[PDB]
Structures are given as C-alpha cells and as structure tokens.
C-alpha cells in the first residue's frame, strides 16, 4: 500500500489508453477520473485506465 | 480516461 489493489475480474483493453488486466493481478492505483468510473493504474504489463469497480484494495 | 463508461461488473 497504501495504493495497492487487486483485480476482481478480467478486463480486456478497449483502446483509448485502457489497460488489460487479469483477475488476481496486482495494481498500483494512480487515481480516478472525474466521475470515478475509471481508474488509472500501473501493473507489470504497463499503465492505463481500468474500470474502478473491477478492482479492490489489498494488503 | 475514456469518455464512454466502462463495462459493468462482473
């Protein structure tokens, strides 16, 4: 932490700076967009936007 | 961030 999250579900990138993530994968969250629907995160595979409710804080 | 909404869970 204090910004460490884990993916709840698979999410396939749809372009537009989004990031593919796999259930169980760890992320570090940089922040959220204006309405909180999108979350900008970093994983071992890169950096991009993922659905906010597709992840949850761990540790 | 994208200007369209993300897919709903799950």
Describe the structure.
The complex is a heterodimer of chains A (59) and B (10). Chain A is mostly beta strands and 59 residues long. Helices cover 0% and strands 44% of the residues of chain A. Chain A has a single domain (1-59), classed as SH3 Domains (SH3 type barrels). Chain A has no helices and five strands. A five-stranded antiparallel β-sheet of chain A has the order 4-3-2-1-5, with no helix packed on it. Chain A is globular, with a radius of gyration of 10 Å. With 10 residues, chain B is low in regular secondary structure. Chains A and B meet through strand 4 of A and loops of B. It is classed as transferase/unknown function. Keywords: beta shandwich, SH3 domain, kinase, poly proline rich motifs, transferase, Transferase-unknown function complex.
What do we call the CATH homologous superfamily of chain A? SH3 Domains
Instruction: Estimate percent helicity of chain B.
Output: under 10%
Spatial separation of the terminal alpha carbons of chain B: 20 Å
How many E-type strands of chain B?
0
CATH fold assignment of chain A: SH3 type barrels
H/E topology pattern of chain A = EEEEE
Main sheet attributes: strand count, strand direction, barrel closure of chain A: 5 strands, antiparallel
| Major interchain interface with per-chain residue totals | A-B, 18 and 8 residues
- Examine the secondary-structure arrangement and name the CATH architecture of chain A: Roll
Percentage beta strand of chain B: under 5%
Order of strands in the sheet with the most strands of chain A? 4-3-2-1-5
**What's the overall geometry of chain A?**
globular
What's the CATH first level of chain A? Answer: Mainly Beta
* Cα Rg of chain B: 8 Å
Number of helices of chain B: 0
Structural class of chain B: little secondary structure
Number of strands of chain A: 5
Largest sheet of chain B: none
